[PDB]
Amino acid sequence: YIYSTEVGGVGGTPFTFMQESGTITSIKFNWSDQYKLLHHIEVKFINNANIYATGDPKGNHEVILEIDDDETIIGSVIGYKKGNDGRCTGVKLTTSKGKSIMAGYFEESLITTYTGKLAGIKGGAGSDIDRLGLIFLK
Amino acid sequence: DNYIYSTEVGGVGGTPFTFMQESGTITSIKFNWSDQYKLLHHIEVKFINNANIYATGDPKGNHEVILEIDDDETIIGSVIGYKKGNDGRCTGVKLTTSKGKSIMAGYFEESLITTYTGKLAGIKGGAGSDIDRLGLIFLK
Amino acid sequence: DNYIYSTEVGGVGGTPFTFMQESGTITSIKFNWSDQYKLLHHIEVKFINNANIYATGDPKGNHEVILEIDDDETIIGSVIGYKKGNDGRCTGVKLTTSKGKSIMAGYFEESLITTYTGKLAGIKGGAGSDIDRLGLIFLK
Amino acid sequence: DNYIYSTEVGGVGGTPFTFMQESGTITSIKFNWSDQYKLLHHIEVKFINNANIYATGDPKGNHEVILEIDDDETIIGSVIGYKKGNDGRCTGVKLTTSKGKSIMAGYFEESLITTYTGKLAGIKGGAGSDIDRLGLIFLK
Amino acid sequence: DNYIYSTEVGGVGGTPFTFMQESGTITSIKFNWSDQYKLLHHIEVKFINNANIYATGDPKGNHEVILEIDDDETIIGSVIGYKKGNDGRCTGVKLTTSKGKSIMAGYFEESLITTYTGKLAGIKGGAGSDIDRLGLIFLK
Amino acid sequence: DNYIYSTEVGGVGGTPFTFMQESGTITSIKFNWSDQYKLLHHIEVKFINNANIYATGDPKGNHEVILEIDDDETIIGSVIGYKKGNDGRCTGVKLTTSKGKSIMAGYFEESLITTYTGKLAGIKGGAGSDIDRLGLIFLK
Amino acid sequence: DNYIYSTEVGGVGGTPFTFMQESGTITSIKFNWSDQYKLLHHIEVKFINNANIYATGDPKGNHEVILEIDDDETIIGSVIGYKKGNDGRCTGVKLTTSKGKSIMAGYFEESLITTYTGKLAGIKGGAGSDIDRLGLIFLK
Numbered sequence: 002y003i004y005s006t007e008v009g010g011v012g013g014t015p016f017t018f019m020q021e022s023g024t025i026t027s028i029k030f031n032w033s034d035q036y037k038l039l040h041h042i043e044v045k046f047i048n049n050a051n052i053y054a055t056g057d058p059k060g061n062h063e064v065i066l067e068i069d070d071d072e073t074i075i076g077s078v079i080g081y082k083k084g085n086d087g088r089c090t091g092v093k094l095t096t097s098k099g100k101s102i103m104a105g106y107f108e109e110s111l112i113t114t115y116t117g118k119l120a121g122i123k124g125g126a127g128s129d130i131d132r133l134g135l136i137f138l139k
Numbered sequence: 140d141n142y143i144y145s146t147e148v149g150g151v152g153g154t155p156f157t158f159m160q161e162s163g164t165i166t167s168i169k170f171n172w173s174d175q176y177k178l179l180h181h182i183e184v185k186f187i188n189n190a191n192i193y194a195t196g197d198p199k200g201n202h203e204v205i206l207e208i209d210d211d212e213t214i215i216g217s218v219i220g221y222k223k224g225n226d227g228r229c230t231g232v233k234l235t236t237s238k239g240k241s242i243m244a245g246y247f248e249e250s251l252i253t254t255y256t257g258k259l260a261g262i263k264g265g266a267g268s269d270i271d272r273l274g275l276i277f278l279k
Numbered sequence: 280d281n282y283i284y285s286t287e288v289g290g291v292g293g294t295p296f297t298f299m300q301e302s303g304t305i306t307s308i309k310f311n312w313s314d315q316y317k318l319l320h321h322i323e324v325k326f327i328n329n330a331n332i333y334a335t336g337d338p339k340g341n342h343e344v345i346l347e348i349d350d351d352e353t354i355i356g357s358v359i360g361y362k363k364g365n366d367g368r369c370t371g372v373k374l375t376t377s378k379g380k381s382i383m384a385g386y387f388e389e390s391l392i393t394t395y396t397g398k399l400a401g402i403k404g405g406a407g408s409d410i411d412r413l414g415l416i417f418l419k
Numbered sequence: 420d421n422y423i424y425s426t427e428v429g430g431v432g433g434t435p436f437t438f439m440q441e442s443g444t445i446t447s448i449k450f451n452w453s454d455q456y457k458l459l460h461h462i463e464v465k466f467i468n469n470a471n472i473y474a475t476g477d478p479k480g481n482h483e484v485i486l487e488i489d490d491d492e493t494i495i496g497s498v499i500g501y502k503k504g505n506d507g508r509c510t511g512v513k514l515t516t517s518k519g520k521s522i523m524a525g526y527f528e529e530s531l532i533t534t535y536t537g538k539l540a541g542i543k544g545g546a547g548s549d550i551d552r553l554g555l556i557f558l559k
Numbered sequence: 560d561n562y563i564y565s566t567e568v569g570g571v572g573g574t575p576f577t578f579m580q581e582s583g584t585i586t587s588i589k590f591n592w593s594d595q596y597k598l599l600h601h602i603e604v605k606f607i608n609n610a611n612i613y614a615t616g617d618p619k620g621n622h623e624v625i626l627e628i629d630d631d632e633t634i635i636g637s638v639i640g641y642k643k644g645n646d647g648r649c650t651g652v653k654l655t656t657s658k659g660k661s662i663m664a665g666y667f668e669e670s671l672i673t674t675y676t677g678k679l680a681g682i683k684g685g686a687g688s689d690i691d692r693l694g695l696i697f698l699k
Numbered sequence: 700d701n702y703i704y705s706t707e708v709g710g711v712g713g714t715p716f717t718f719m720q721e722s723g724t725i726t727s728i729k730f731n732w733s734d735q736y737k738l739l740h741h742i743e744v745k746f747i748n749n750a751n752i753y754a755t756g757d758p759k760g761n762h763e764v765i766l767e768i769d770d771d772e773t774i775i776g777s778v779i780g781y782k783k784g785n786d787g788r789c790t791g792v793k794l795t796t797s798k799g800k801s802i803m804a805g806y807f808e809e810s811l812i813t814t815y816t817g818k819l820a821g822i823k824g825g826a827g828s829d830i831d832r833l834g835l836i837f838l839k
Numbered sequence: 840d841n842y843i844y845s846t847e848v849g850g851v852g853g854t855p856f857t858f859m860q861e862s863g864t865i866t867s868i869k870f871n872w873s874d875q876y877k878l879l880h881h882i883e884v885k886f887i888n889n890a891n892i893y894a895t896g897d898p899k900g901n902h903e904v905i906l907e908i909d910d911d912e913t914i915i916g917s918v919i920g921y922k923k924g925n926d927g928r929c930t931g932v933k934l935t936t937s938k939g940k941s942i943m944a945g946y947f948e949e950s951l952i953t954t955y956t957g958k959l960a961g962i963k964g965g966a967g968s969d970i971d972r973l974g975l976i977f978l979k
């Protein structure tokens with residue numbers, strides 16, 4: 002496993018979504034024009050009908066990316082407000098098959114992450130996504 | 140199964156539909172939508188070697204688009220727009236094929252799914268006056 | 280047959296027509312249309328090794344385009360615009376070839392089909408004053 | 420023959436002309452046109468191994484463009500603009516070669532033909548004060 | 560050495576810094592800058608196999624960008640903007656990697672260097688309230 | 700000969716010039732032009748293995764461009780602008796090489812020729828105060 | 840020699856300079872220019888395996904640009920702007936490398952040379968308060 006920097010604030014309840022010998026097949030991002038933040042994320046893993054969720058699903062928008070079993074992330078950008086009082090603002094992902102999604106806003110700070118097979122996510126959430134970091138295979 | 144089910148997106152309303160063929164795939168798919176409600180109202184599908192039309196929803200929109208699919212031709216990119224919620228609806232579809240054919244139907248103002256790719260084999264969801272919910276189905 | 284029939288789109292009106300030739304393909308196609316009605320009115324087709332001009336519909340429009348097709352040249356992209364319904368009509372045609380030639384004829388305000396691709400071999404549909412419906416025919 | 424004849428487009432007016440040479444091809448072509456009438460008026464042509472200039476039409480226009488063609492050079496895209504009708508006229512010519520050379524001469528605010536491609540071998544049509552019609556001729 | 564040192568650009572101010580490691584390269588670099596002063600203020604760096612964060616300058620800017628670098632990933636394009644002079648400053652950085660990742664930080668209004676390319680191994684310069692001077696370091 | 704002569708374009712005025720060398724090619728060419736008259740006034744040429752500068756016309760323009768040509772480098776695109784007529788003049792030159800070098804000199808408002816391509820070997824035409832006419836010369 | 844000398848462009852004044860090294864090539868070049876006079880004023884050059892900085896002209900401009908050159912990296916495009924005349928001057932430089940690096944320094948309002956390409960090995964010309972003239976030098 003490769004751990005990409007968790008970006009955003011130090012707030013919210015911790016979460017770690019990863020599963021032995023499995024990878025992410027679906028990820029959903031929920032955000033608002035009201036606060037220009039991510040509020041909620043859900044993830045499903047290959048061979049597991051369970052939905053792992055975090056944060057309050059209170060936003061007016063929601064995008065889903067479904068990921069073929071041989072499909073990698075070749076480009077990834079997370080927008081955030083920096084600081085202890087920080088927050089995760091947006092996500093742009095682009096895959097090895099030219100699929101892409103764009104969620105929320107990118108007006109303050111950006112990270113272009115590591116690339117590879119997306120395997121999990123970790124960070125903190127409450128009303129909002131406080132911090133978010135991606136996890137890849139090695 | 141031998142099938143991949145992409146998420147049914149939209150609401151919980153309407154009459155169920157499931158359109159698949161055991162040793163067959165979709166060769167033609169049609170989307171009907173309105174500028175009045177910015178929704179998808181009606182869908183039709185034909186399957187390889189079968190002139191019969193499987194249809195669902197009320198064909199009441201002012202626009203229709205049809206995509207024909209060559210027998211060796213895959214979907215390499217697929218986006219469905221929808222309103223989220225139990226009271227949700229399907230809003231638009233963009234498909235792009237392995238031969239650079241593409242279609243764009245309805246609106247993409249609220250929520251989006253970029254689906255799984257592959258040989259498009261069927262569709263399932265619910266419809267009434269509108270397309271309440273839609274999920275694509277692929278081979279392996 | 281050894282032919283692929285793309286959906287005839289438009290209305291149910293007009294006199295039937297079918298233009299094909301055994302062991303022959305289309306080398307020239309002409310579209311005639313009006314800004315007055317935003318419709319196709321007339322189509323002509325010539326086939327390799329055949330000096331005859333096969334025509335249908337009333338040649339009443341203010342615009343004409345001709346596409347000539349080299350013997351080894353395929354259609355790699357094809358879009359037909361139409362008004363849907365029993366009362367429908369064929370509104371426009373956009374073709375792009377394997378040699379980067381392209382044409383755009385009439386209007387695409389209501390409904391679209393992206394057809395099958397391949398070596399264009401014939402056309403079938405109905406015409407009178409206008410082109411009621413039209414469908415392309417390719418080779419396998 | 421061993422020649423491919425693109426459609427002569429334009430009107431039925433003027434004196435006929437045919438510019439070809441057995442075992443020869445065109446190395447230079449000149450188009451003369453006016454902003455006053457938005458028409459071609461005059462064409463000149465030279466052939467490989469022949470210092471003679473073949474001309475047709477009245478050279479009265481304010482613009483002139485010349486395309487020289489290398490011996491292994493081929494036309495990969497060609498458009499002629501024209502006014503349709505018995506009283507028709509040739510309005511413009513756009514050629515693009517296999518070496519990325521191109522020219523654009525006169526106007527295209529009317530009917531258009533995308534012709535056949537290949538080694539340009541000659542031209543035929545009718546001319547007087549104006550170029551009434553024009554058709555390209557290629558090898559095989 | 561085993562290292563290529565690109566010119567330190569900017570002023571002679573601030574506290575020196577040198578961030579390198581034996582048998583190691585940079586996996587993460589962060590730039591902090593302001594719209595108020597159109598300068599870089601703060602930089603952080605992590606190295607492969609070392610959870611420590613090496614920092615310099617005052618983190619007082621309204622913007623931050625981070626570039627994470629895969630173990631086999633090189634810099635193929637690099638531009639640093641700066642004010643020249645003893646009282647100089649580092650104004651902006653544009654980096655582009657061998658995997659098409661890129662970042663753009665701060666402003667490019669006065670002077671530019673396009674640096675040497677390769678596997679980024681470290682950085683060195685001076686910082687205080689702002690980043691006074693900066694120079695990249697690559698492998699061989 | 701072993702030479703290809705592009706059309707001399709422009710007027711019939713000025714003193715003749717012909718600049719060529721057996722078993723030699725052009726390595727440098729300079730064009731001098733004015734915004735006052737929108738004409739070329741002066742041209743210079745150097746040949747491989749020959750320190751001499753061959754010049755013609757009055758060097759009175761406010762602009763000069765020089766193209767140096769590597770020994771294996773060809774002209775793949777060439778455009779000369781001119782006023783047609785007995786009282787004609789050469790107005791501008793665009794050249795583009797096999798290595799993507801290019802130059803653009805003077806104006807292109809009236810008439811254009813896209814010439815033959817190849818290894819540029821010499822120039823011929825007439826000059827006085829202005830470049831009256833100009834024709835390029837290539838190898839085989 | 841084993842060197843190619845591109846035309847020195849600009850005026851005949853300034854103090855002569857020639858920067859070359861046997862079995863060595865340029866790894867860094869810096870250009871200093873002003874918006875006040877729209878001229879280059881100063882140039883510095885470093886060579887592979889030589890910590891010395893070779894400089895010429897008065898470093899009085901408000902802008903500076905530096906290009907670093909990897910050991911296997913060539914100039915594939917070079918453009919120098921200048922004022923022509925005995926009282927001439929060098930106005931700007933644009934360089935593009937075989938790795939897609941580039942720089943742009945000063946102004947290009949009067950005259951241009953698109954010089955020879957290859958491995959940049961040295962520079963020669965004249966300088967004082969400004970860069971009177973400048974010529975690049977390449978390998979073979």
Ligand SMILES: OC[C@H]1O[C@H](O[C@H]2[C@@H](O)[C@H](O)[C@@H](CO)O[C@@H]2O)[C@@H](O)[C@@H](O)[C@@H]1O
Binds near residue numbers: 433434549
């Ligand atoms: O196409 C040009 C035309 O030139 C000559 O006729 C011209 C003129 O004299 C006539 O008055 C008008 C009438 O329509 O036509 C031309 O402008 C003839 O050579 C004619 O055959 C030719 O078409």
Ligand SMILES: OC[C@H]1O[C@H](O[C@H]2[C@@H](O)[C@H](O)[C@@H](CO)O[C@@H]2O)[C@@H](O)[C@@H](O)[C@@H]1O
Binds near residue numbers: 572574689690
């Ligand atoms: O990095 C800029 C600057 O930082 C520090 O200087 C600060 C302050 O003490 C100085 O007085 C003012 C300028 O006079 O600049 C900053 O506010 C020092 O580290 C200095 O070396 C450096 O230039």
Ligand SMILES: OC[C@H]1O[C@H](O[C@H]2[C@@H](O)[C@H](O)[C@@H](CO)O[C@@H]2O)[C@@H](O)[C@@H](O)[C@@H]1O
Binds near residue numbers: 852853969970971
């Ligand atoms: O290109 C710089 C220029 O520097 C020197 O000339 C300077 C001065 O001495 C001249 O008199 C003024 C004229 O007002 O021009 C410069 O300021 C000389 O080295 C000269 O050759 C050179 O051009």
